[PDB]
Design a protein around this nucleic acid. Sequence first.
DNA 1: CCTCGAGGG
Length: 727
Amino acid sequence: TLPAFLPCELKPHGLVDCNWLFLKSVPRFSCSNITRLSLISNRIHHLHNSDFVHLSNLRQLNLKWNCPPTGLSSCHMTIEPRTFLAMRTLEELNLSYNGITTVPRLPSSLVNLSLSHTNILVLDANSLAGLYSLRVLFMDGNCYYKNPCTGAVKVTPGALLGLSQLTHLSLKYNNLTKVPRQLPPSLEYLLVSYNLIVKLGPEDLAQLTSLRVLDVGGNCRRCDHAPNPCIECGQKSLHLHPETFHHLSHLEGLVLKDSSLHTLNSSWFQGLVQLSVLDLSENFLYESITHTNAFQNLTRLRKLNLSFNYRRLHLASSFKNLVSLQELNMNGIFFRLLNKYTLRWLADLPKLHTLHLQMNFINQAQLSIFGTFRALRFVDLSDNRISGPSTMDRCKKFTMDLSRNNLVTIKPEMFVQLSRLQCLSLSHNSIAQAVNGSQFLPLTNLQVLDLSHNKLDLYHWKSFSELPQLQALDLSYNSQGIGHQFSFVTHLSMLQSLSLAHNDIHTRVSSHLNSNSVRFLDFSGNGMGRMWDEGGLYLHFFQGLSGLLKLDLSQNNLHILRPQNLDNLPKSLKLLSLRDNYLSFFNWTSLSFLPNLEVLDLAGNQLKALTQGTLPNGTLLQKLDVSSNSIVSVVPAFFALAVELKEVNLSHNILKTVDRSWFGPIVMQLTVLDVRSNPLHCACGAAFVDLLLEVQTKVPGLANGVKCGSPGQLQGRSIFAQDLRLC
DNA sequence: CCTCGAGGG
Ligand SMILES: *[C@@H]1O[C@H](CO)[C@@H](O)[C@H](O)[C@H]1NC(C)=O
């Protein structure tokens, strides 16, 4: 009757969630059917032979973050010999972020193991005894600046050969000077990044002929302008032996990032015939990518990262061979100019769909080039310094992001040959301009336009009229004696979504917003309280938006909401958000003025009670959110008439109980009833317990998150800390 | 390998 696994939550697939519960011991709670137990981030510092005896059938166990090394502000975990042996079908185990110095004894059933961020500094053949079914082993971060050790962690030669089935090995951030010797040949991937492996040769990868991904990056770093502690490389560059990767016939992925690579050598990729991913970021290949020939035979290369390579830029002719290339990252390279030659050799690549060009300080750009490519779907030029022509965004659609640039004026010529663009972002520029229908002529196909965080003045009624396919327009956070603000809206014939959120609404703001197409309007963070206080002037401000379905009036300083104003909102309205206003009183029967309303959000107001009316017949209301108010009481039968009521959020209020007289029969059709963060009074007779237990599947966090506000020793603790059914 | 140089897995 009480949920079975207090103080934890039962979740469907045999999962018992005991996360973040301040537990100091493994809970005891039949348990013969639980197969998964998560105990993430509790306070368990000691583990004992008998601690898992009741969970003999566990397959998955997460003990992450129970006894962190430092860490935080220092913990050592003790584990008895037979602790995990009681679970002889245990398949997965996470011991990461625990102060253990040796790996515990484990059952041979184990398949996945994490020992990351512990204090295990030695792995020998004894450490992993009998893990012959192990496929996954992670142990990162046991000897770096956040989890320091003296010297390095040692993996002895052949220590892991017993792991006959090991496909996955990660040993990052462990101060390794060399790749461990005689690693299991079954390895399909090996991560040894961010150690001190300054030298690499075919010897170091001897017999790893089953590798699909190898990460040897960050082993020779340059620590100039490194935010966190960095160990500067002893040499000019990662020393790479030409034949190192030659035998890696199945290598699909290779990352050589942050290796201080000054040149590329085609030898490296010679034997890599299924190489689909290559990461070359954070090196010094600026000149190299401008001239090299290494790319000439990488014909299966799908993804390529060239980001943050330091010293007129032109991608080398070798790029023309990358006919499988789908994605190219060129962030943070820094080139002043983007021209017709800069990216020339990418133009005929059959399936190049994504191009990252962030943070390059580009101040002159012939964007026209992006109309010549074969299948560009996304070009990110955000955070550059583009100021003009050359001399809702999802869209996940030919898309271009020009946000955080230097546009002050938009000129139609900057968009020549970009006529195929369906999504554009000019957000976070400094565009102060009278928009008037003469800015985006070539953008004939533009459906989504983000002009947020700019300084547009929108008095002109011809605004955006040259965008015939415009469906979604974001004018959020816009800062403005002729024309009228927002007058253009009615003339945008296919506009479905519009945001005018957090704007500067001045005297001659159009008293009417009109449309036949707008279905969603975000009018958040404006002054609708101040506007509706000006009498009849704005009484019908939204009425002209025919077919309007969703309206957001959050953060509009609404202190009152008269029936006049609700009645003159479009009768089509299905969703209305009044979140974070100052509503103290509200006749709930006034909701009958919103016939088709289904979702109502009134959170962050000061409705001290649900007392003033009832949910009217025969409303179609489905979701009511009245959280973070100050509700201290509700009238019986309040929710009774809302036939279609499914979700109601009463959380973060001041309810001393939750009574069934409120809902009646509809309490059993409720999919969600959220009553957390109410100061419930947990006397020994309290009736709310049996009620919540009746709809327990439908109240989130009931097991431990629904807590008492009184009496004093129960203050801040769950309604199940003591059994309240006793009295 | 991936997401948002460290962390995840
Ligand atoms: C109820 O509202 C609270 C307000 O903070 C929110 O945290 C929670 O997500 C909501 N509950 C549900 C089930 O959506």
